[PDB]
Amino acid sequence: KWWERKAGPNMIDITSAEQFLNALKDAGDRLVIVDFYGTWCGSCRAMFPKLCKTAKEHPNILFLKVNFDENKSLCKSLNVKVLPYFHFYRGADGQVESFSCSLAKFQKLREAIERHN
């Protein structure tokens, strides 16, 4: 599957609600970037290499990949309405970013990271 190709060790597939919370809790005070994507999302597929490169460049950021099509109830509960979409979480602060971005507007994701390192 395209979302598995060249994905580094800080990029994890989320397949259940409990696993999602455990990942957020176990992250401690680390920045967590949650990548909501779809199996047939062209933009998602197109930006994946850039996302993988970003993860390699930031080994201490945790990237959680959430396939909307395989976790629909979870994504709906989280108010995710369009794909690609991102939530950032960090420790006690909980959710600290919530946004979409284009392939060409990938710099918005980099700017979001820089707001939280």
Curated annotation (Swiss-Prot):
Any coiled-coil regions, as ranges: none
Superkingdom: Eukaryota
Cellular localization per UniProt: Plastid, Chloroplast stroma
Disulfide bonds listed in the record: 41-44
A GO cellular component annotation in the UniProt record: chloroplast stroma
Main location: plastid
Domain Thioredoxin: 1-117
Active site: 41 (nucleophile), 44 (nucleophile)
GO molecular function, one term: oxidoreductase activity, acting on a sulfur group of donors, disulfide as acceptor
Keywords tagged on the record: Chloroplast, Disulfide bond, Electron transport, Plastid, Redox-active center, Transit peptide, Transport
UniProt-listed GO biological process terms: detection of redox state; regulation of photosynthesis
Protein family membership: Belongs to the thioredoxin family.
Function noted in UniProt: Thiol-disulfide oxidoreductase that may participate in various redox reactions. Possesses insulin disulfide bonds reducing activity.
Identification of the protein by name: Thioredoxin-like 2-1, chloroplastic
Organism per entry: Arabidopsis thaliana
Lineage of producing organism: Eukaryota, Viridiplantae, Streptophyta, Embryophyta, Tracheophyta
